Design a protein around this nucleic acid. Structure first.
Ligand code: F2A
Ligand code: MN
Ligand code: MN
Ligand code: MN
Ligand code: MN
Ligand code: NA
Ligand code: NA
Ligand code: NA
Ligand code: NA
Ligand code: NA
Length: 316
DNA sequence: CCGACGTCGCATCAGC
DNA sequence: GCTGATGCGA
DNA sequence: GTCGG
């Protein structure tokens, strides 16, 4: 809420560059600046103040000035009035419509949720589902419901095989009070770097059978993306939620939990002060080189001579 | 001045 | 019918 | 768009 006006402005610019301009490096530039400003412990009084911060340069400092003086950005006003820009931006809010599909839809006069309904025939399976749950997928998930969902996931996974280990990561694991979705990391001792054909399928199938998973967006041997829903009390239906399950080699569990706990910006940063310290971290391993042994998230921190950050202190 | 700035599993579908 | 090219969410 | 070459 502190430099919230500015970070909102920047995120909106980011989204425009990604969805309309298809300029992914400006999108990332804008998010990097929003992130460095969100972490700043002072109320920014000028663009020059922001300019001191890494990731904030000449053009963003100048936009910060306009915003502080005026309480708006003209270019964002100009964007939001443009019919093509605003329509493409809107449509990308549907899961399964990205910058390319949105643009093609808008080009052929399909620019609203009603137009999408009227044109279901031109939608693929993922986009029809994105449209069906358009509102639901934009609602956040209260931590209380994340706990209910957690217990159901871990429980049903155990019912398939007691040796599976399921871990809810993402914002949930960072201790957020609401989450955009549920991300589940799965492991099983039968699956490691060296050694599975139905390991994930068995878990998805069980979750469908107890009617927790309601839809499938994509599913392979290591990655499920779908829809789920907590069961209802006469009382009101819960909204449908996005759920991601990843099946990961047991011996890369800690690098995976680290990565899939995030945040995305944090992961970018840690990777930075690992490269600076003689290391390469990816979702699977830390290497100097062959993969160094790891027995905790802490270890990866130690390696790169960072003090351990709790999941909570990672939402950056 | 200017090149770097994430890579990937999974789904669809022109163009043969 | 097939698959290399492309798009999606991440 | 930004920053280090
Ligand atoms: N661009 C990126 N770079 C590095 N890591 C990335 C990443 N995008 C996602 N991740 C990783 C970390 C997320 O916490 C984790 C989940 O990705 P997610 O897309 O479900 C976003 P999350 O952090 O869970 O918050 P929320 O909005 O869902 O409540 O996957
Ligand atoms: Mn219409
Ligand atoms: Mn998430
Ligand atoms: Mn997710
Ligand atoms: Mn292929
Ligand atoms: Na200070
Ligand atoms: Na700067
Ligand atoms: Na989308
Ligand atoms: Na999301
Ligand atoms: Na420079």
């Amino acid at each position: 809420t502190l430099n919230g006006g500015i970070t909102d402005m920047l995120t909106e610019l980011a989204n425009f560059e990604k969805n309309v301009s298809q300029a992914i490096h400006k999108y990332n530039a804008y998010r990097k600046a929003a992130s460095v400003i969100a972490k700043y412990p002072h109320k920014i009084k000028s663009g020059a103040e922001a300019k001191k911060l890494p990731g904030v340069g000449t053009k963003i400092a100048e936009k910060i000035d306009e915003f502080l003086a005026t309480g708006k950005l003209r270019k964002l006003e100009k964007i939001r009035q443009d019919d093509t820009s605003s329509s493409i931006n809107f449509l990308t809010r549907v899961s399964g419509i990205g910058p390319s599909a949105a643009r093609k839809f808008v080009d052929e006069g399909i620019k609203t949720l009603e137009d999408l309904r009227k044109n279901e025939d031109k939608l693929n399976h993922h986009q029809r589902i994105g449209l069906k749950y358009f509102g639901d997928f934009e609602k956040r998930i209260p931590r209380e419901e994340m706990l209910q969902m957690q217990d159901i996931v871990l429980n049903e996974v155990k019912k398939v095989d007691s040796e599976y280990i399921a871990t809810v990561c993402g914002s949930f694991r960072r201790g957020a009070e609401s989450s955009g979705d549920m991300d589940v990391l799965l492991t099983h001792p039968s699956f490691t770097s060296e050694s599975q054909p139905k390991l994930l399928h068995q878990v998805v199938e069980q979750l469908q059978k107890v009617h927790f998973i309601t839809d499938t967006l994509s599913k392979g041997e290591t990655k499920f993306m779908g829809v789920c829903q907590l069961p209802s009390k006469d009382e009101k239906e819960y909204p449908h939620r996005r759920i991601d399950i990843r099946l990961i080699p047991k011996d890369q569990y800690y690098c995976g939990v680290l990565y899939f706990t995030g945040s995305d910006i944090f992961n970018k940063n840690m990777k930075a002060h690992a490269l600076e310290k003689g290391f390469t971290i990816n979702e699977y391993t830390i290497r100097p080189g062959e993969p160094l042994p790891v027995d905790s998230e802490k270890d990866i921190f130690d390696y790169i001579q960072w003090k351990y950050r709790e999941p909570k202190d990672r939402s950056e």
